[PDB]
Amino acid sequence: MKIGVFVPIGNNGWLISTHAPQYMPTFELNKAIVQKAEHYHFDFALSMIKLRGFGGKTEFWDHNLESFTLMAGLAAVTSRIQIYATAATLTLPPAIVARMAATIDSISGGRFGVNLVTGWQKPEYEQMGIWPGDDYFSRRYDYLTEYVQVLRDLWGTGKSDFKGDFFTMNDCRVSPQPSVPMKVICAGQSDAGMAFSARYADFNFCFGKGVNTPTAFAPTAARMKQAAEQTGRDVGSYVLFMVIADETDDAARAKWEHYKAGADEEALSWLTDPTSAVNINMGTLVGSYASVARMLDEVASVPGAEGVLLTFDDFLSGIETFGERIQPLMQCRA
Numbered sequence: 001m002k003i004g005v006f007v008p009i010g011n012n013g014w015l016i017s018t019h020a021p022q023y024m025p026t027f028e029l030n031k032a033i034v035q036k037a038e039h040y041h042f043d044f045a046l047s048m049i050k051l052r053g054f055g056g057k058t059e060f061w062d063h064n065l066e067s068f069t070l071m072a073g074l075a076a077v078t079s080r081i082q083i084y085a086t087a088a089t090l091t092l093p094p095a096i097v098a099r100m101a102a103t104i105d106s107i108s109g110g111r112f113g114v115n116l117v118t119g120w121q122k123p124e125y126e127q128m129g130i131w132p133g134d135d136y137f138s139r140r141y142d143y144l145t146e147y148v149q150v151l152r153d154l155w156g157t158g159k160s161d162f163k164g165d166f167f168t169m170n171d172c173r174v175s176p177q178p179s180v181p182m183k184v185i186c187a188g189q190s191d192a193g194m195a196f197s198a199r200y201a202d203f204n205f206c207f208g209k210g211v212n213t214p215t216a217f218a219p220t221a222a223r224m225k226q227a228a229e230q231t232g233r234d235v236g237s238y239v240l241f242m243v244i245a246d247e248t249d250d251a252a253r254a255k256w257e258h259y260k261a262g263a264d265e266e267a268l269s270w271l272t273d274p275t276s277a278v279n280i281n282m283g284t285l286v287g288s289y290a291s292v293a294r295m296l297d298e299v300a301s302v303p304g305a306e307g308v309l310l311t312f313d314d315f316l317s318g319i320e321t322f323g324e325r326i327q328p329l330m331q332c333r334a
């Protein structure tokens, strides 16, 4: 099974709590996380793009860097880990993304890929006058389909004459082309998003589910496999989890309860043994190092599942204990 880190490009990472660690997104902090992840042989690092926050006491995700420039900086100070940036396809013309991808290909020595998203949060776009209208909800995958067509032409041949409902290329040129086949990833959950992934992506990110129910995502992995049958391409599922680990189950539980007890209620209204809104109801693994190792091995046994994307309650020490105490107990990592 492959392991990735979801880098905190937004303040406070993925916890919405006055009891969680408080921190701004900085290059230097992201550099330390990624270099540490590479040291423990994490396979990849991914950053999202979030253009509007949720406010509250913690000003949650009011502070966010930009994904491509962050990942270019990170590529420059690593050498082995795969590096993925997110393109919000409403905000960048495909030929720019094309050239940015070739650029970070040059920086990393062929370790860069791109996560393509439609966007769905109207305020992110309307705040700057570029929301296309409420039709986009149902049509966004048609839009992304044209978008990826243009990228593929440009990476593939260095030119495009594509013409459709949303783009017109008249001998558009982008060169150099990537030194290695350019990876595309997607995060579609719906039927239409999974069909997109099956056609054009190298793998599909989905959500882990529940708290200490590591296999509860299995029906999503099953749908993605079905979608992949329709194109006969090998597109596996990578699953997002939060890891809250400690020396014992008891201690990890105490940490999780403390976070939830500090829930930033105001930030949470803007947004909206069960999951909690404090980490946006993300699939959560809470336990001793050994317990988490076991649940991750349970994840590796789900048909479809090729990897996990990890967040932590604290990234610098979370990566540490992952490398030192969790990874070494994992069958799927030996």
Ligand SMILES: Cc1cc2nc3c(=O)[nH]c(=O)nc-3n(C[C@H](O)[C@H](O)[C@H](O)COP(=O)(O)O)c2cc1C
Pocket: 047, 048, 049, 050, 086, 088, 116, 117, 118, 119, 120, 186, 187, 188, 189, 190, 191, 192, 193, 194, 205, 206, 207, 240, 309
């Ligand atoms: C790991 C992960 C990362 C994501 N990153 C972003 C992002 O950076 N920007 C964004 O607008 N959406 C992001 N999304 C949301 C998805 O691209 C997608 O729109 C959503 O899961 C809904 O499914 P659908 O688009 O097929 O309806 C992310 C989703 C996942 C699972």
